[PDB]
Amino acid sequence: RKQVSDGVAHIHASFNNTIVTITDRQGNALGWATAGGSGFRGSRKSTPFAAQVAAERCADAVKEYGIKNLEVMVKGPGPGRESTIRALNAAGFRITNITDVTPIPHNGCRPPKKRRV
RNA sequence: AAGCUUGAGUCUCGUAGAGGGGGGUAGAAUUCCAGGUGUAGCGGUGAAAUGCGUAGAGAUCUGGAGGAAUACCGGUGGCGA
């Protein structure tokens, strides 16, 4: 139950939800928060108004692990992809590294051609 | 019929091309397969709701299977009947 004080964090932001995880370098998820957790419907869940109020709800999910130094990984296009990071910095945590890992389309299967209006 | 070539043709040394055929040859995610870490959320629309989820989802990792097409350069561009 001593604090670990060092680790990693993973950010996901899609066009329909922001999902943030505080992780371990072994690939474990230690605590999580979702922007649909604020009760908001549809693409609201991808805005800073939703993503900025998931960060300290994610810091609450590791309250017995104890955090201080974090290395961040970020994926997805959603607007909330950085306000959730600044809100976590403003919670009293210190970012050791920031890296973007958003995929570049490879094969991609089938796209909308043929796109909804 | 006899006579020609400066109509037509083939070629010495050489030129580009997503053309065809046969071979290959390489990578990614939705998926599937066996599990961990973990808690109530996920999914989605102009609005919502069936539905996925506590049988432990979504997501995040380990090791692995499956199928298709060939990102970038790529255009002011080539080739092919």
UniProtKB/Swiss-Prot annotation:
Single annotated GO MF: small ribosomal subunit rRNA binding
Any Gene Ontology biological process: translation
SUPFAM superfamilies the UniProt entry points to: Translational machinery components
InterPro entries: Ribosomal_uS11, Ribosomal_uS11_bac-type, Ribosomal_uS11_CS, Ribosomal_uS11_sf
Any Pfam family: Ribosomal_S11
GO CC field: cytoplasm; cytosol; cytosolic small ribosomal subunit
Keyword terms: Methylation, Ribonucleoprotein, Ribosomal protein, RNA-binding, rRNA-binding
Superkingdom of the source species: Bacteria
Family statement: Belongs to the universal ribosomal protein uS11 family.
Subunit organization: Part of the 30S ribosomal subunit. Interacts with proteins uS7 and bS18. Cross-links to IF-3. In stalled ribosomes contacts ribosome rescue factor SmrB.
Functional note: Located on the platform of the 30S subunit, it bridges several disparate RNA helices of the 16S rRNA. Forms part of the Shine-Dalgarno cleft in the 70S ribosome.
Miscellaneous comment in the UniProt entry for this protein: Has been predicted to contact the N-terminal domain of IF-3 based on footprint studies; exactly how IF-3 interacts with the 30S subunit is controversial.
Protein name: Small ribosomal subunit protein uS11
